[PDB]
C-alpha cells in the first residue's frame, strides 16, 4: 500500500570552528536517493542511488539551489533558537528537521509531515490535519503563533499535496525495481548455553525489505516482554535489513518459547520453536 | 523534490 518520501536535515553550530554544518538526506521508504553536505567539496545535491542518476540536468541544478536555500534558513533558525531560549553563542546546538508525504496503492495523497527538534527534543510539528501546529515547549508557542498568523501551514500543505507527491510518484516509476519490491526475511533460531541453569534463544530475520518488521517472544502462548532483548533493525549494506530478538531461558524450558515474525513479504506470520 | 521556501522559527 503506502509509499513515503522523507527529507532528514541536521544543522550543528560549531562556534569557533566556523559556520554550522548542514547535512540533508532524502529517502523513498528505506532507500536513500540524495545527500547534501555543507562541508563537502562539491557544494551540490548528490545522487545516492543508481536509479536517480537518470534525472535530467535541471533536476540537479534546481535541487542544489533549493538545498542551499534550506541551508541558509536553518542556519538563521539556530540563531533565533538562541534568542528564544536565551542561550550563549559559545555553545554548540543541533536543529533537526524532517518533512515529506505518503501515497497509497491508488497513488493518492495520504499524509504530510513537517517537524523540528532542537538539541534532540521535539520543538514544533505540523498536525496530521495540516492546518495547525503542535508546540512541545514555551519557546515553540512563540513560533506557533507567528506561523498561525502567517498561514505557514496552508503554504506547506500546497507543497506537500503538490511538488512532494509529484516527486514521490515519479521516483516510484523511475526506481520501480528497487522501491516497489518486498524481500521476505530468512529466519532461524540459535541457542547459546550461558550456565548450568540458564541459556539464550536468539530469533533471526535476515535480508528483508522494507525495514518494517515485528519479532515477538511468547512462553506457552503468553507475551514475554521480560528478560527479552530487541536490537535496532540494521542495514546489511546492500538494500536489505537484519534484526534479532533474544530471551534468556532456564535450561530444559526451551520448547515452551515461540518467536513470532510479521513482515509484508510473508503471506502469514511465522512461528519458530527451538528443535534443530 | 524539495520545497522552494522554508519557514523561519
Amino acid at each position: 500500500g503506502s509509499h513515503s518520501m522523507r527529507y532528514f536535515s541536521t544543522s550543528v553550530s560549531r562556534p569557533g570552528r566556523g559556520e554550522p554544518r548542514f547535512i540533508a538526506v532524502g529517502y523513498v521508504d528505506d532507500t536513500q536517493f540524495v545527500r547534501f553536505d555543507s562541508d563537502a567539496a562539491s557544494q551540490r545535491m548528490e545522487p545516492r542511488a543508481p536509479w536517480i542518476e537518470q534525472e535530467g540536468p535541471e533536476y540537479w541544478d534546481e535541487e542544489t539551489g533549493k538545498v542551499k536555500a534550506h541551508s541558509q534558513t536553518d542556519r538563521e533558525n539556530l540563531r533565533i533558537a538562541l534568542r528564544y531560549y536565551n542561550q550563549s553563542e559559545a555553545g554548540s546546538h543541533t536543529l533537526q528537521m524532517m518533512f515529506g508525504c505518503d501515497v497509497g496503492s491508488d497513488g493518492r495523497f495520504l499524509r504530510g509531515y513537517h517537524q523540528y527538534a532542537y538539541d534532540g527534543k521535539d520543538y514544533i510539528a505540523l498536525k496530521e490535519d495540516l492546518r495547525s501546529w503542535t508546540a512541545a515547549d514555551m519557546a515553540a508557542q512563540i513560533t506557533k503563533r507567528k506561523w498561525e498568523a502567517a498561514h505557514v501551514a496552508e503554504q506547506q500543505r500546497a507543497y506537500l499535496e503538490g511538488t512532494c507527491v509529484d516527486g514521490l510518484r515519479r521516483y516510484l516509476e523511475n526506481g520501480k525495481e528497487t522501491l516497489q519490491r518486498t524481500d521476505p526475511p530468512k529466519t532461524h533460531m540459535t541457542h547459546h548455553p550461558i550456565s548450568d541453569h540458564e541459556a539464550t534463544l536468539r530469533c533471526w530475520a535476515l535480508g528483508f525489505y522494507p525495514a518494517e518488521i515485528t519479532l515477538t517472544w511468547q512462553r506457552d502462548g503468553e507475551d514475554q516482554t521480560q528478560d527479552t532483548e530487541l536490537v535496532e533493525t540494521r542495514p546489511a549494506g546492500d538494500g536489505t535489513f537484519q534484526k534479532w530478538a533474544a530471551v534468556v531461558v532456564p535450561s530444559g524450558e526451551e520448547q515452551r518459547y515461540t518467536c513470532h515474525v510479521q513482515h509484508e513479504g510473508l503471506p502469514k506470520p511465522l512461528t519458530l520453536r527451538w528443535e534443530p | 523534490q524539495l520545497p522552494r521556501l522554508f519557514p523561519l522559527l
Epitope: 538563521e76 540563531r79 503538490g162 | -
Partner: T-cell receptor, first 110, second 111 residues
C-alpha cells in the same frame, strides 16, 4: 520566461471583468493579485494556493488551473472605483521574491 | 499600511549619491527591494533574511548597495546617479510568504 497578462481591459459598469494571467512554474505554491490606484502603492488584493481550484471574497473570485498555469481574477458588479492596475505575481526561485506581470489597467465605462 | 519608506519623493542632480530608508512591519524577517517604472511591474533588486543579503539581481550594479545592519531597517544607496535610475523604489516585508509593500521612494534624476 515571464508572467504574461494583457496591458488593458475595458468593461461596462455593472458587468463582470475577468483578468487572465499565465505564470512560469507549476511548483509555485501561491499566486497574488496586487492592485495599484493612480497615487497609492501596491495593495495586496487576493491570493490563492496551488492546491485550491477557486477562492471567493466579497465581489472578487480567483480561479486557478495549476495544470495550464492559468490564474484569473473575476470582479462581479464592476463599479467605477474598481479602475486601477491589476498585477499578478508569482514567487521566483527559493527566496519568495516575486516576479510581476506588466499589469492590466482596468477601464470601467459609465 | 505597516511598511514605512523615507523619503516619499527625492530630487538629486545627476552624478550625486542618494540613500533611501525602509522600516518593515515590526517583526518581519524577510525584506525585499523592487524598482518600478510607470506602466510596468516591479523588478526585484535584492533580498534580506534578517541581516544576510542572500540574493541580488543583475539590475543591482556596482553603483547600487543595500544594507540591513541589525535586521530592522534597510537602506538602498545609489552612487553617481544616471537618468535611467529615475523610478519608484519599493520595499516589501513578510513573516513567510505574504509580501506587504510600502508607498515607495519616487526618485527623479535631473541634469
Amino acid at each position: 520566461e515571464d508572467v504574461e497578462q494583457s496591458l488593458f481591459l475595458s468593461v461596462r459598469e455593472g458587468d463582470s471583468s475577468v483578468i487572465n494571467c499565465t505564470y512560469t512554474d507549476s511548483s509555485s505554491t501561491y499566486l497574488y493579485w496586487y492592485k495599484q490606484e493612480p497615487g497609492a502603492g501596491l495593495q495586496l488584493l487576493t491570493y490563492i494556493f496551488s492546491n485550491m481550484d477557486m477562492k471567493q471574497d466579497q465581489r472578487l473570485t480567483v480561479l486557478l488551473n495549476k495544470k495550464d498555469k492559468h490564474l484569473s481574477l473575476r470582479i462581479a458588479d464592476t463599479q467605477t472605483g474598481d479602475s486601477a492596475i491589476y498585477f499578478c505575481a508569482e514567487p521566483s526561485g527559493n527566496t519568495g521574491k516575486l516576479i510581476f506581470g506588466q499589469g492590466t489597467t482596468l477601464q470601467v465605462k459609465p | 499600511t505597516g511598511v514605512s519608506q523615507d523619503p516619499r519623493h527625492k530630487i538629486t542632480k545627476r552624478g550625486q549619491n542618494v540613500t533611501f530608508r525602509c522600516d518593515p512591519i515590526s517583526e518581519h524577517n524577510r525584506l525585499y527591494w523592487y524598482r518600478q517604472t510607470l506602466g510596468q511591474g516591479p523588478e526585484f533588486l535584492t533580498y534580506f533574511q534578517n541581516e544576510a543579503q542572500l540574493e541580488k539581481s543583475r539590475l543591482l550594479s556596482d553603483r547600487f548597495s543595500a544594507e540591513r545592519p541589525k535586521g530592522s531597517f534597510s537602506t538602498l544607496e545609489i552612487q553617481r546617479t544616471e537618468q535611467g535610475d529615475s523610478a519608484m523604489y519599493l520595499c516589501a516585508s513578510s513573516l513567510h510568504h505574504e509580501q506587504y509593500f510600502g508607498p515607495g521612494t519616487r526618485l527623479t534624476v535631473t541634469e
